[PDB]
């Protein structure tokens, strides 16, 4: 297996930092600098041993070809109306980036509106955010290069798809909202910083400001409408009310589902948007989330979690703002999470609920909050929707582990609502009938029942002989719901695998209580939940530790890496994608400061104590038992991942290779693959996606010696 030698990596034994009396050495701290010749050489040497290992087993070629075939199917988004025209995204099958089409009529012939594919040879320039003007005659869109979060906003005139000269730079984590007068658009921008701003830098992002750009002018003329010099981490996103009268400002600090809500009655501005707006601080604290749904005059309907962990809808009247006066339009459910709400056809509300990690869709009346219609859906997730206040119809996209996805449409003007299939594509190759998805609830260490989805071929023997791929995230109120993955189904069909997704704490599956159940002092709950999920699959005979693979990305990357350190005996293979590995320094880079709401910060003595116990980078240790070694490990990252700076994986792999790799008993490989012209994941071209999943399953195939099944 290991027919190579790990690269010689220098250890700076003098790099020792004090954390409230706790001294920690950081010998690979030099890897934090992406531009040095030393780090560049480290990356080059790592990939030099990783690549040949991945490409050696012919299985990679078989998987790649099979993925190219199965992934080649029509992928559409929901149709959405803007002005007098309809729009929808569409990928014929293997295009690197999906294309935006336009058609003047629902029955009319569509034409390409914007094709990101012609902007680069390798499809590494992608659309990241967009917003049409209220009348739908002007379009603003963001473009990111090589997977970076940095955006450049460009403009177009819809009629004739004419390119405009307006160009906005230094845009990141930005809103995009046109004022209804059609004069300009609000957006967020960061101050000028030394060094690079292309996604390879590690520089922290602070002092984000809200600007307003007048169409037809240079960015230098942009009006500063809001800023927080005393609070560097505050981020203010703007949006216009459905009636265009109010600018709603949602200020966030961190990643908790909470925000301050300030508003500006545009009718009350002296003479238009000329500077800092006359903000009325309706909700001036970070105690709850207030998500704007719609308003009728001064009565604003918001989805909130204020003393409602599963979320509810409340009406706040600007003329009588006190909390005791707020009306509860749609009360919180005792268990089901209200994920999102949209207002359509003037007085209808589309409510989407998460019931035991499965979605439901319902139409409610705006005035009373009363349920009017239940849109029939199978076991899966709603991952697409269209229907604004002025629209008279809705489109919604449904998907599941076994179904590619069905797009439904419903004309809301009709007396009797008849929802119908608008678009449905099937993947000829993966016969859904041959598989089944079962949901179970297993007890974690403390007794808490945790949901887990298992996908496998029908009629398999539970004798523990099957390879398994267990996925998890566990954090930031993110719910891991059913989704169609061609890559995972190939593992099932062509590698005889068992798929599993553990809905561990930290996620939003059971509201804010579920979220708080996997954060700060209780982050260990996440790891414990996932480890118990692994034990469940083993105990119940779905797989065995030597046949088990665990995967996670970003916060899930931390999940799988930590689980490798804590229970190396439970897994055969671990694939950690773009993970947070250095829990003591994560807050120092790019947007890392925002994650402290989930992890805490090492600056605090109390937080450091939680963090030091699980930080992957600080817990690599040779297993005590002679018959126990670390499982095979593959860390995937990229040089433009400015969300989770690559240094996390660089320092981690260097530590794994030195501490564990050098031991005799370590026969399983510990590798890293750093991709070029790629970032955290969003906007990654189809070509790179296929290369990535091929590397993953080939690594698994080679390490567990799995035969490909034709
Ligand atoms: C992947 O899990 C990484 C590392 C841990 C958190 N995280 C993120 O990408 C988080 C959670 C999803 C969104 N996110 C994030 O940092 O978004 C940037 C941001 C935007 C607006 C306010 C604060 C942060």
From Swiss-Prot:
MF-aspect GO terms: serine-type endopeptidase activity
PROSITE patterns linked: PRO_ENDOPEP_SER
UniProt modified residues of type N-acetylmethionine: 1
Reactions the enzyme catalyzes: Hydrolysis of Pro-|-Xaa >> Ala-|-Xaa in oligopeptides
EC number(s) given by UniProt: 3.4.21.26
Domain of life, source organism: Eukaryota
InterPro entries the record matches: AB_hydrolase_fold, Pept_S9_AS, Pept_S9A_N, Peptidase_S9_cat, Peptidase_S9A, Prolyl_oligopep/macrocyclase
A Pfam family: Peptidase_S9_N
Active site: 554 (charge relay system), 641 (charge relay system), 680 (charge relay system)
Expression sites (tissue/organ): Ubiquitous.
Keywords: Acetylation, Cytoplasm, Hydrolase, Protease, Serine protease
Compartment(s) where it occurs, according to its Swiss-Prot or TrEMBL record: Cytoplasm
Residues found modified as N6-acetyllysine: 157
GO BP, sorted A to Z: proteolysis
A GO cellular-component term linked to this record: cytoplasm
Enzyme class of the recorded protein, top EC level: hydrolase
Post-translational modification summary for this protein: The N-terminus is blocked.
Family membership noted in the UniProt record: Belongs to the peptidase S9A family.
General function of this protein: Cleaves peptide bonds on the C-terminal side of prolyl residues within peptides that are up to approximately 30 amino acids long.
Protein name: Prolyl endopeptidase
Species: Sus scrofa (Pig)
Underlying gene: PREP
